[PDB]
């Protein structure tokens, strides 16, 4: 009715509660969460033991049919203890539907690969291990995909500056393309965009 | 087994490593206890005993392998 | 106090790794300066691995050492087949860089910088 | 609950102490009511109506920086009332404020202009 | 008549699509009468295995068996059956039908911190 | 819906005529000789090319070109120092500084805009408030320098004053649809 | 649209196509580079009453996820996520090329 306003169907809300509960019943021993969004899209939280059981039942299962991988990320959160939330969103042709499955990690405690599931998630880890440090298990080759060769540091983690540590130059001395520490021009001006009144309050977290 | 050859070929070996001294080595002395030496050295000195020997030696024999004595007996009992 | 181990049970097959990824990088230096046309000598290039092996040294614990050998092997097989190329193998040395001596009245001549 | 009244925000129980405003029990529960002309240590005015909000089972809203909480009232501090009133409150001020934002040193740091798209 | 093509690449034509479907949901089923009784997987997947049967045994026409089975064509069916018989045993293998392994901390779900 | 752009319906059967077609076809080169025959029309046609530089590719009045400052007819800049622009500027091309000028007007006392930072999308001459920052159509400025492109409030004027009979004109003929 | 008729019939015999009624150059179909003014119309919320922003706020009536299940805080027939998808009906214009 209103022309400003995103029209909701509730109908897509049902199905996927539904098929929610449906996986967290099948799957009580990997699934910590189960979550439907205020934009229809199903998310499950679940341990990093069941990552290849979870995928292989959405992949397999006659109802899931899940055989389409979206893409594979991660989320730095540094003020959790597993500080990289590694996020699988696929999508089921058989059904129409798209999931998402969420578990976390952090420096030092790998996650298994589901190049075994899905192929795409060979560059897909490797794009995650290059980008925040994630190990991955019974990876065929995990290794840099979009640094620069040798780059010293995970460019995608929080606390990594967004200009980096060093920058390239020629140096005609030596004839070639070296790397100092970085020198700006102009620095960063970093802005403080935060108004200080709370804007929704349906989001309002409990004082602690 | 030319138990002669092999140990005399060891030693030229410890001599020809530079980070060592010829005047305090000798067949009994130990690396770290006497040499003063490190474990990447140690395994320096079995990579030198692999590239002048010719045959491999596994990661699991190096941390027995710990004075020239015990190379030359091994290589006496592998050869 | 009590954590998921990558490879490494302990300390001992984690110093164990280590030694075969320093093994192998002492092996593949000469190959490394023989094929990119290094400046470099091979004796000062296995001394800038040793040195980078010894600032890695002062850390015990078999995750992280586990990790730091997973890194090493890494760079090691990008330098086996060869994508690091002169410019990136000779980033290790830093000789177009002046260096900032450490002594409190030369850090107290160029500036700010503790 | 020796010398303490129990009042709800949203539903929420909270205790206060007798003579607590409505806007100090709202900012106990964790909740900002919008001000202009309230500060916590000057004289309380009452006069810019910003803080209006709908008492549970009142007909008329009251201002939170100057109505002290009585007994057992349910603060519907986001209701429709409540909202309508903050949206009026800030039509009459920018009805006669002047379009001077891009010459004004206030840029960024006006609760006008701040409250204004908030409410 | 027998479909001349799948119209997907790389999947074959099967002449016989009855008796495939009918040994491939009886050895899911043999292979799901193994796990526990309170397994819902089991229940699950015993649900969809016997209705499928019952409707590959109703129908015998191909086209109106794929129309009922809507899962795209009958060799897709035929895929379908072998994944999921797959997935079982590994499902027997894995045993998720136990309770939780671990929880969580706790804020590691919440959003925004 | 759905169609299919490779498949065929059941079969056209092999008969004497059709084979002797096929091998007429990959025997006399018939689609190489229409191929050919084609190319030829076009041959024939004529060049769809302009004669640079006397004859310039057509342009519209929204075009983002060089940046300019533009003044009120009276003379006056007229920005007038409220950092939106450089707010708004995603790449951080523009830098501002300003103060109270003698007769105490908000004026800046630095403007520089990078061009070589800049990315041209026109968010500082659309969150302008005053339409003083703006993207003339001037694109033929090609510097033989790096410094060259580093724009300052001095040559930012210096285009609003040289390029003000063309920029007016484009504000006048668009500002309707902004 | 300068060329001679010979040349046209040249071109349209050796391409096959009609190349006279449509031609890539655009001379003078197109628009006028100078257009009258025109007077954009306003949205729906530009109203003078019963406009009240709290009843088309679209952005605060986003709500927190619903949680089906938690592990901290929480015969049936099986489901799927959606309906299965109709299989698509074959182009009544051009099924085949
Ligand atoms: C034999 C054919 C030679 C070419 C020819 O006559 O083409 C004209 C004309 C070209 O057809 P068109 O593509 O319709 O002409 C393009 C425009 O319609 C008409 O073109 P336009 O209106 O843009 O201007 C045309 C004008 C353009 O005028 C000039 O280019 C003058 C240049 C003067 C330089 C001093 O005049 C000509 O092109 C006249 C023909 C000149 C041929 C010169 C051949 C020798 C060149 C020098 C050799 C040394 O030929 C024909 O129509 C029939 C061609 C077959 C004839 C047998
Ligand atoms: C040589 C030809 C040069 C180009 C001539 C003009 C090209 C355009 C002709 C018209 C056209 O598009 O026709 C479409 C048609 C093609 O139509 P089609 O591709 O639909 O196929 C014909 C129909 N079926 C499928 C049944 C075969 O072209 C022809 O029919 C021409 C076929 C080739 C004829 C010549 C074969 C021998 C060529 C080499 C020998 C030397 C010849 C003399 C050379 C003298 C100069 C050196
Ligand atoms: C040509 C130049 C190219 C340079 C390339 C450099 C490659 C760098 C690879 C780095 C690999 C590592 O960092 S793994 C090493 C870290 N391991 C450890 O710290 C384990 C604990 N360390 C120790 O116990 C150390 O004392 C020793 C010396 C490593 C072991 O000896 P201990 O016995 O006494
Ligand atoms: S057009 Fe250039 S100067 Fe203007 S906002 Fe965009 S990037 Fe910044
Ligand atoms: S937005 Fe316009 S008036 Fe404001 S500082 Fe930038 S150029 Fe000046
Ligand atoms: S804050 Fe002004 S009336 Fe209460």
Same mark, same amino acid.
């Given at each position: 009715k209103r022309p400003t306003v995103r029209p909701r169907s509730d109908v897509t809300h049902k199905q996927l509660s539904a098929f929610g509960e449906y996986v967290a019943e099948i799957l009580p021993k990997y699934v910590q969460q189960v979550q439907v969004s205020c934009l229809d899209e199903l998310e499950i939280c679940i341990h990093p033991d069941g990552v290849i059981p979870?995928?292989?039942?959405?992949?397999?299962?006659?109802?899931?049919?899940? &055989?389409?991988? $979206? /893409?594979?990320?991660? %989320?730095? !959160?540094?003020?959790?203890? @597993?500080?990289?939330?590694? %996020?699988? @969103?696929?999508?089921?042709?058989?059904? @129409?539907?798209?999931?998402?499955? &969420?578990?976390? $990690? /952090?420096?030092?405690?790998?996650?298994?690969?589901?190049?075994? %599931?899905?192929? $795409? $998630? @060979?560059?897909?880890?490797?794009?995650?291990?290059?980008?925040?440090? !994630?190990?991955?298990?019974?990876?065929? /080759?995990?290794?840099?995909?979009?640094?620069?060769?040798?780059?010293?540091?995970?460019?995608?983690?929080?606390?990594?500056?967004?200009?980096?540590?060093?920058?390239?130059?020629?140096? /005609?001395?030596?004839?070639?393309?070296?790397?100092?520490?970085?020198?700006?021009?102009?620095?960063?001006?970093?802005?403080?965009?935060?108004?200080?009144?709370?804007?929704?309050?349906?989001?309002?977290?409990?004082?602690? | 087994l030319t138990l002669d050859g092999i140990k005399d070929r060891v030693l030229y070996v410890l001599k020809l490593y530079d980070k060592i001294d010829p005047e305090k080595l000798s067949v009994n002395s130990h690396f770290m206890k006497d040499l003063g030496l490190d474990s990447l050295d140690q395994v320096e000195i079995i990579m030198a005993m692999e590239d002048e020997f010719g045959f491999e030696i596994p990661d699991i024999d190096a941390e027995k392998l710990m004075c020239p004595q015990e190379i030359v007996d091994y290589i006496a009992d592998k050869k | 106090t009590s954590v998921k181990p990558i490879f490494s049970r302990d300390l001992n097959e984690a110093k164990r790794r280590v030694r075969e990824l320093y093994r192998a990088w002492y092996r593949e230096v000469p190959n490394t300066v023989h094929l990119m046309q290094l400046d470099i000598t091979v004796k000062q290039g296995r001394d800038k691995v040793r040195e980078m092996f010894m600032k890695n040294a002062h850390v015990t614990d078999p995750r992280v050492v586990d990790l730091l050998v997973i890194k090493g092997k890494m760079e090691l097989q990008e330098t086996i087949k060869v994508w690091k190329q002169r410019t990136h193998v000779m980033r290790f040395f830093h000789e177009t860089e002046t260096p900032r001596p450490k002594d409190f009245l030369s850090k107290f001549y160029m500036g700010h910088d503790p | 609950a020796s010398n303490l009244i129990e009042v709800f925000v949203d539903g929420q129980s909270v205790m206060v102490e007798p003579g607590t405003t409505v806007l100090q029990a709202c900012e106990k529960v964790g909740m900002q009511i919008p001000r202009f002309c309230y500060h916590e240590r000057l004289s309380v005015a009452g006069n810019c109506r910003m803080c209006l909000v709908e008492i549970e089972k009142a007909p008329k809203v009251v201002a939170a920086c100057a109505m002290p909480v009585m007994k057992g009232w349910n603060i519907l501090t986001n209701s429709e009332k409540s909202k309508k009133a903050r949206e009026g409150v800030m039509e009459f001020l920018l009805a006669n404020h002047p379009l001077d934002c891009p010459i004004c040193d206030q840029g960024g740091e006006c609760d006008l202009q701040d409250q204004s798209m908030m409410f | 008549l027998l479909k001349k093509t799948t119209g997907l690449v790389g999947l074959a034509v099967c002449d016989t699509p009855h008796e495939r479907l009918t040994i491939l949901y009886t050895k899911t089923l043999d292979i799901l009468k193994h796990f526990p009784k309170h397994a819902a997987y089991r229940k699950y997947t015993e649900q969809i295995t016997n209705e499928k049967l019952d409707m590959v045994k109703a129908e015998p026409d191909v086209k109106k068996l794929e129309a009922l089975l809507q899962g795209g064509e009958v060799e897709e069916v035929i895929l379908q059956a072998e994944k999921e018989l797959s997935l079982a045993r590994k499902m027997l293998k894995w045993k998720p039908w136990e309770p939780l392994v671990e929880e969580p901390p706790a804020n590691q779900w919440k959003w925004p911190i | 819906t759905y169609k299919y752009v490779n498949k065929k319906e059941q079969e056209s059967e092999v008969d004497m005529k059709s084979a002797t077609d096929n091998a007429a076809r990959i025997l006399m080169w018939t689609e190489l000789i229409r191929g050919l025959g084609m190319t030829l029309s076009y041959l024939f046609r004529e060049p769809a090319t302009i004669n640079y530089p006397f004859e310039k590719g057509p342009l519209s009045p929204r075009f983002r070109g060089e940046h300019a400052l533009r003044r009120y007819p009276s003379g006056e800049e007229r920005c007038i120092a409220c950092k939106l622009c450089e707010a708004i500027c995603p790449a951080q091309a523009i830098t501002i500084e300003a103060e109270p000028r003698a007769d105490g007007s908000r004026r800046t006392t630095r403007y520089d805009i990078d061009m070589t930072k800049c990315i041209y999308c026109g968010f500082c001459q659309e969150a302008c408030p005053v339409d003083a920052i703006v993207e003339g159509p001037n694109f033929e400025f090609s510097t033989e320098t790096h410094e060259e492109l580093l724009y300052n409030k001095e040559k930012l004027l210096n285009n609003g004053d040289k390029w003000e009979a063309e920029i007016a004109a484009n504000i006048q003929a668009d500002y309707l649809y902004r | 649209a300068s060329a001679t008729r010979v040349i046209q019939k040249l071109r349209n015999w050796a391409s096959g196509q009609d190349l006279q009624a449509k031609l890539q150059l655009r001379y003078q179909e197109i628009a006028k580079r100078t257009q009258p003014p025109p007077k954009l119309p306003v949205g729906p919320s530009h109203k003078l009453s019963n406009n009240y922003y709290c009843t088309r706020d679209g952005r605060r009536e986003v709500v927190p996820p619903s949680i089906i299940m938690s592990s901290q805080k929480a015969e049936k027939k099986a489901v799927t996520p959606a309906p299965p998808m109709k299989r698509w009906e074959l182009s009544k214009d051009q099924p085949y090329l």
């Open positions: 979870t995928l292989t039942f959405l992949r397999d299962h006659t109802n899931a049919q899940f &055989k389409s991988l $979206a /893409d594979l990320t991660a %989320v730095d !959160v540094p003020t959790r203890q @597993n500080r990289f939330e590694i %996020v699988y @969103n696929l999508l089921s042709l058989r059904f @129409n539907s798209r999931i998402r499955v &969420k578990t976390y $990690a /952090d420096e030092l405690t790998p996650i298994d690969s589901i190049v075994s %599931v899905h192929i $795409a $998630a @060979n560059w897909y880890e490797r794009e995650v291990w290059d980008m925040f440090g !994630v190990f991955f298990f019974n990876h065929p /080759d995990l290794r840099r995909i979009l640094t620069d060769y040798g780059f010293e540091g995970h460019p995608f983690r929080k606390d990594f500056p967004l200009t980096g540590y060093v920058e390239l130059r020629y140096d /005609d001395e030596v004839k070639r393309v070296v790397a100092e520490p970085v020198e700006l021009a102009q620095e960063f001006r970093k802005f403080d965009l935060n108004s200080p009144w709370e804007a929704f309050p349906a989001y309002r977290q409990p004082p602690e | - | - | - | - | - | -």
